[PDB]
Amino acid sequence: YFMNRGRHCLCVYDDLSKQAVAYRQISLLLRRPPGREAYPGDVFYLHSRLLERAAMLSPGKGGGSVTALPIVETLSNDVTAYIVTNVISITDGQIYLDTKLFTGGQRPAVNIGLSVSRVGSSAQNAAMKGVAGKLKGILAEYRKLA
Amino acid sequence: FFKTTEMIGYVHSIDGTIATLIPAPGNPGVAYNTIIQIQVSPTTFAAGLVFNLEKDGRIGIILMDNITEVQSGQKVMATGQLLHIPVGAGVLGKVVNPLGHEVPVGSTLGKVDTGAPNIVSRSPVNYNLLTGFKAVDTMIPIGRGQRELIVGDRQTGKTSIAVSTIINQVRINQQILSKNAVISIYVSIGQRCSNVARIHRLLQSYGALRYTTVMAATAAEPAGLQYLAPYAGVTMGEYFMNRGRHCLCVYDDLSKQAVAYRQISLLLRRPPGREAYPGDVFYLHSRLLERAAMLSPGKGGGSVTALPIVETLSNDVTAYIVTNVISITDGQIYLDTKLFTGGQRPAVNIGLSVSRVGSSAQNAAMKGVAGKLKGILAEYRKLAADSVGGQQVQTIPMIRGARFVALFNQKQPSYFMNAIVSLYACLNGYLDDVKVQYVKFYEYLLVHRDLGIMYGTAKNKFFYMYVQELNYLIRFFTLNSPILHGELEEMLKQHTHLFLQHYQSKMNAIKSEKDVKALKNLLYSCKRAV
Amino acid sequence: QQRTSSLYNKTRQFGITAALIEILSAMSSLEGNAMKGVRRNKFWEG
Amino acid sequence: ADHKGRVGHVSQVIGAVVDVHFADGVPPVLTALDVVDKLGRDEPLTLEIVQHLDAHTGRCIAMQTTDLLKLKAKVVSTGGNISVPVGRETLGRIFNVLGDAIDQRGPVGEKLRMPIHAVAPKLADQAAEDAVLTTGIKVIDLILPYCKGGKIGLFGGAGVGKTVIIMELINNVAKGHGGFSVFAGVGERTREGTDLYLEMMQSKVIDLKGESKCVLVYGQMNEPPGARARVAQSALTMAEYFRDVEGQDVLLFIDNIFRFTQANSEVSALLGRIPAAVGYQPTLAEDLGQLQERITSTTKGSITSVQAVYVPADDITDPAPATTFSHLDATTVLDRAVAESGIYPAVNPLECASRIMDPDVISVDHYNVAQDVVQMLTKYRELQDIIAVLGIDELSEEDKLIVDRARKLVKFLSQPFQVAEVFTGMTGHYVQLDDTIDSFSGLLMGTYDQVPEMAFYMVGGINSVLEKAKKMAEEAAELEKMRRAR
Numbered sequence A: 001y002f003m004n005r006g007r008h009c010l011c012v013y014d015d016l017s018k019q020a021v022a023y024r025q026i027s028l029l030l031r032r033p034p035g036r037e038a039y040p041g042d043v044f045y046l047h048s049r050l051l052e053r054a055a056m057l058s059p060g061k062g063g064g065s066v067t068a069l070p071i072v073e074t075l076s077n078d079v080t081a082y083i084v085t086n087v088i089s090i091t092d093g094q095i096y097l098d099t100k101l102f103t104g105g106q107r108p109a110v111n112i113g114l115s116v117s118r119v120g121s122s123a124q125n126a127a128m129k130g131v132a133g134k135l136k137g138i139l140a141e142y143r144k145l146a
Numbered sequence B: 001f002f003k004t005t006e007m008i009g010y011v012h013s014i015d016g017t018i019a020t021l022i023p024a025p026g027n028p029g030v031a032y033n034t035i036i037q038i039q040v041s042p043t044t045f046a047a048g049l050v051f052n053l054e055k056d057g058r059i060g061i062i063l064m065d066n067i068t069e070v071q072s073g074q075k076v077m078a079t080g081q082l083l084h085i086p087v088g089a090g091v092l093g094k095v096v097n098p099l100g101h102e103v104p105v106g107s108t109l110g111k112v113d114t115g116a117p118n119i120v121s122r123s124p125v126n127y128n129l130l131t132g133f134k135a136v137d138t139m140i141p142i143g144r145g146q147r148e149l150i151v152g153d154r155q156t157g158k159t160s161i162a163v164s165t166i167i168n169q170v171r172i173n174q175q176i177l178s179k180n181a182v183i184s185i186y187v188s189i190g191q192r193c194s195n196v197a198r199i200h201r202l203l204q205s206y207g208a209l210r211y212t213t214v215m216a217a218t219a220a221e222p223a224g225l226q227y228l229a230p231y232a233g234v235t236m237g238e239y240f241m242n243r244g245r246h247c248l249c250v251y252d253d254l255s256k257q258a259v260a261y262r263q264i265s266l267l268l269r270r271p272p273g274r275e276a277y278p279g280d281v282f283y284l285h286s287r288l289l290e291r292a293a294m295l296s297p298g299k300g301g302g303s304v305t306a307l308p309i310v311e312t313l314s315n316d317v318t319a320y321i322v323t324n325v326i327s328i329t330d331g332q333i334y335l336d337t338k339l340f341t342g343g344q345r346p347a348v349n350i351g352l353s354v355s356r357v358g359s360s361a362q363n364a365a366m367k368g369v370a371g372k373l374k375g376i377l378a379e380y381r382k383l384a385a386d387s388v389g390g391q392q393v394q395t396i397p398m399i400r401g402a403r404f405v406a407l408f409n410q411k412q413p414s415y416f417m418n419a420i421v422s423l424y425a426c427l428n429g430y431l432d433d434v435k436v437q438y439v440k441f442y443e444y445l446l447v448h449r450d451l452g453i454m455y456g457t458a459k460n461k462f463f464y465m466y467v468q469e470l471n472y473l474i475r476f477f478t479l480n481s482p483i484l485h486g487e488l489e490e491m492l493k494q495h496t497h498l499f500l501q502h503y504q505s506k507m508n509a510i511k512s513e514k515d516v517k518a519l520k521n522l523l524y525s526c527k528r529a530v
Numbered sequence C: 001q002q003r004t005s006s007l008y009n010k011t012r013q014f015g016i017t018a019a020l021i022e023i024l025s026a027m028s029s030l031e032g033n034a035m036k037g038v039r040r041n042k043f044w045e046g
Numbered sequence D: 001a002d003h004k005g006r007v008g009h010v011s012q013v014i015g016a017v018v019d020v021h022f023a024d025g026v027p028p029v030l031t032a033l034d035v036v037d038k039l040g041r042d043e044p045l046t047l048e049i050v051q052h053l054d055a056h057t058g059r060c061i062a063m064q065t066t067d068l069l070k071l072k073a074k075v076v077s078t079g080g081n082i083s084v085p086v087g088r089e090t091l092g093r094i095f096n097v098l099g100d101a102i103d104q105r106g107p108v109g110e111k112l113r114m115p116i117h118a119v120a121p122k123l124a125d126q127a128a129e130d131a132v133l134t135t136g137i138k139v140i141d142l143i144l145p146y147c148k149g150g151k152i153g154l155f156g157g158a159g160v161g162k163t164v165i166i167m168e169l170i171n172n173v174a175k176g177h178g179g180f181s182v183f184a185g186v187g188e189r190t191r192e193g194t195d196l197y198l199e200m201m202q203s204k205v206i207d208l209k210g211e212s213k214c215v216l217v218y219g220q221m222n223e224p225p226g227a228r229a230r231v232a233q234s235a236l237t238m239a240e241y242f243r244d245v246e247g248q249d250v251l252l253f254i255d256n257i258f259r260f261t262q263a264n265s266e267v268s269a270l271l272g273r274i275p276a277a278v279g280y281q282p283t284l285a286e287d288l289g290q291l292q293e294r295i296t297s298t299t300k301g302s303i304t305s306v307q308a309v310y311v312p313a314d315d316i317t318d319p320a321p322a323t324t325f326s327h328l329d330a331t332t333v334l335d336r337a338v339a340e341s342g343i344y345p346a347v348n349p350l351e352c353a354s355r356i357m358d359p360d361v362i363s364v365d366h367y368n369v370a371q372d373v374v375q376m377l378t379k380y381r382e383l384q385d386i387i388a389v390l391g392i393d394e395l396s397e398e399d400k401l402i403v404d405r406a407r408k409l410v411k412f413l414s415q416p417f418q419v420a421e422v423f424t425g426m427t428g429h430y431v432q433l434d435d436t437i438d439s440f441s442g443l444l445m446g447t448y449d450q451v452p453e454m455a456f457y458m459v460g461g462i463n464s465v466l467e468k469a470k471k472m473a474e475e476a477a478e479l480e481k482m483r484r485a486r
Ligand SMILES: Nc1ncnc2c1ncn2[C@@H]1O[C@H](COP(=O)(O)OP(=O)(O)OP(=O)(O)O)[C@@H](O)[C@H]1O
Pocket: B152, B153, B154, B155, B156, B157, B158, B159, B160, B161, B345, B346, B410, B411, B412
């Protein structure tokens, strides 16, 4: 509603992992062919038609926006799960919260090594872009040195 | 002869050992899980069990006998009664079918589907049941009313332990009153008829058939029989339980029962589950093992001890059936292949074996010995962990652990007095000067011989190992009592001194090509003689 | 030991799921091939 | 209500699944039906509607064996869901899924009954703020504090005194918070249930001649899956009554929660539903949610549940534990190694966890002390390994004061329980929350650096430590004085 009117919005889905379970529950109750990990074949389409509605509309349409922060739960830091990979194949970037850092007192435990933003670089503010340009190299060297 | 009452329908379909019936005119009804007779021949009948009652009127039937004579279109009669099998003291010493029919060899009725005792009708497990093996009786106690699993791989010594346990009760039932006697029920499921015969001969050789009954549902018998054998077995055993007596039911084995139940369910189009087993498989085993209990004194004080046997393929305890049985039984005895090939027989892996009942199922004398025996063995294993190289150092805990792990090697069950005495001797250090290779020979001389009498040195008045009636005195009075402690130490000290002086001295002096062989043969014979 | 254990516990979970899926697929195939025949009842008597 | 006494006839019987035909229409789902025909059955037969096949036919799950059951057998609706008695008359008694006393100790004489299935509290009934549950145990109330409206996983099998801890929690909660307890045995061995009942009567938590402070609800293994999947809800309903009507902080023990999941899985398989990953039911998340969500802290009272968890095949990623752990607000690990070290309660402080370990919930002093204790214990482990290669004499004097304080802490986290005042002989202790915080805070600073190490063994509070130290000093002086005489 706000994007179509030229305003901005932020949607937080907590979480798409539990939506898939519910959709899997519905499909199996309907006796449909189970797929990988018993999830239905169209589980990917379930999240595709959702996240694709999050967009930055062109100037002609009003310059609206719906940022989306879907959440996903892994097991034993496994990013090779079926649902995890499907969402990673849809989103424009990922923030990975390593358990080891969190238990070690390092919060929010953002594992910068695995995290990435594929399209957010341009939107970064000029001031923070200046500070972050060198910070990237400093951290990169620091990880290698230890 | 099951008494037929009315015609309920006509056979419609046959799929191996599974049949379907279509209703007779008027659509007469038949009670669920009841018995029916199919008129195969003019005066002969085939037994069947009702399993499904479909909406349209069709009935699912599990055939039990005379399947080759069953044809579509035949007439079916119903008995309207559950399965009841003969039970009583008149069945002991016989081979019996799960349907109650006697199997030729070369008192009342009991329901085969009965509920287990409730919470208030049970009592804590305190009375022990001796398997005759030092390892089991010490590290994995078994108490009357307990459900102890025997899990192992093929050809590891599972059937042997249960048979020995049954045999070990013969020498006890003959002495004490029949009230406390243990009646055995061995259930063979999906085995060969040859194995049943050999077991029958083996029991008869030691005179166990007088206190034992065998229920056989062998291969070449329809799956329906193999699925009902354990339930009939406990039904025979529950007769003694409800009459203040004790029973011991052995199932060999539940692995084959589950397969038969799977075959029946799948052929009757029931929803499969994990490993294709139905959803009732856990319920099937639970309602079987839960029927083994220890009744309270207000209901006679009877009991049923269960010894289910399970075969684990490739040492995998993650299978569906194995996990379910393990989650039901009160502990487990794990028989390991490597130990069996390593000369350790019984091959109990004490690390993976457990008894949730604990010391409560041990006698006073055994409890005192086991309290220290368990601690010593753990240290030996931990120090044995460093024994892979490094020239393990022989501390007293290791000097005694090795003897303990060598006394546990046996073929036949041991009389309680012989076992408890030998463990006590090794516990107090009387075997520290005895080499590990000669332990079995030392034990044999202690049990079947008397060095003190041989050399005219014995001074004890009553405590001699040839007095087999001291067992009950030891059970009543622990070895650590002034009545028996003094003479026990004297005999052990004298026997140890004579053995070292006369026998082991000659053994260490053997230098020849034939004497060495004779010594080796003697040690091997003593290994399987006690 | 921590990497080969995960692949062993992940494999057993996948193995159970696939075997069960196969069985149900066969069950659904034999159910689908089955067809209900004409109902021979006194439809008028109702 | 309008379907009270409605009549139907059995139409199909396949194992534990029974289809009933009602001429007037099937009652609502989850309705209870009684089979009037007890021709040859030794027990009454009750069915629970789970599905509707048509406007007149309904599928149901039998709570008992379906033996001697014929088609067209008469069945009568009970007028609603399964009804369980609730009140103060159920204390000290044993029940089943149907709320029938199986202890053979006379009629219950309840004044009211409640349905098994009740909607979870709405979002508006939730508690305003998180609150701590003072269990009276030093370790639990310091390093892994429990929470009202919380679900706590008691990992660790038997042989570690699990039952003793349960009895102590039951006694302490009533002693301090005046809240009762409900124990639910789901798929539990009948032998162990008997042993637990005898122990409870021996510890006086269940006083036959007095006032009891615990209810028992047992669905055993020998019972069909239809019962094991509703016993927990029956027990939960009993707790809900105390939570709402009496406004108390009740306890709900579950032994185990995995058996509840397994039972529903079997039930789903019988109905013919397609299982999900690892053979579990597709409704696994929903089944647990409909149960756990009812366990929360409301504006009237609270229900804190201590659930015994079992990990199949030692796989923590299995869907059953994985789904369960998402509902747990605390973990208690019981280890034999600690028990073999003589530390009872046998709790591994570094293996436990809790979500309310945050200053925003607990007092700042409590959080700082707990973190300091954890850090000291972790350092004590590394120092323990260093001395293995060196010897304590090598360690620095900071690391030899830190190896002395840590040993005192490990000894100070043990506690003698009042439930064992009989079989162990030592008077029990109920250490207050504030007392524990102050005692540990003083110990960490180094105030009690002169007290002997053994003075902290099996004691409650700091005053007990001082009293034990004085007695030890007096005994030592007397022995030395006697030695000088001879
Ligand atoms: N304690 C023992 N000492 C020596 N040999 C033993 C002992 N127990 C069993 N054996 C021998 O080991 C072999 C296997 O024994 P057994 O028949 O009990 O195996 P099992 O567990 O029943 O295997 P399976 O039934 O699958 O063939 C036999 O030759 C038997 O004589």
